[PDB]
Amino acid sequence: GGLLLQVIQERMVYYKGDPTSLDFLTQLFDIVSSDYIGMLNQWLLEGVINDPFDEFMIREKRVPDSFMEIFQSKSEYYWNELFLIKIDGLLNQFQNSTI
């Protein structure tokens, strides 16, 4: 899934001094990451998660139908528990509690 960015970044350490190889790897990383930037931009600009592949780090989860009436009354737990951060897919930039 989102592990590709980690592989490219790990791969890019060895070719950090090679101009052509670094240019190609940087171009590939830039184009590949564009979807992730789209998800992040929509999340921070409109507060909407769009792509249903569960790729994005901010995991909004659906309430089960069996508990719909319960969660509607106690909206605090809906808005505090059913939004999570998927730690596996985070880059080192976001590996900070405050961010």
Added chain:
Amino acid sequence: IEPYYDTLQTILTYLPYTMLGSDSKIFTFSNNYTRLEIPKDINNSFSSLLREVFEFAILYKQLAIVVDRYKGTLVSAIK
């Protein structure tokens, strides 16, 4: 002079393959590509001349080995 002088254009046929650091039917590398054996039927003069030409082949082979070995292993940016 042909009747009175014996030695193996045939050299130039197999020389390009040796120059590019590859094994040849009359020139064979050995000892991890550190020495090259000049065959029999190459009299003194031609062998002495080839010893100068083959300097490029062995040196290039060593450089190619280094490049292929350390292509993406070294971590330091300078190297």
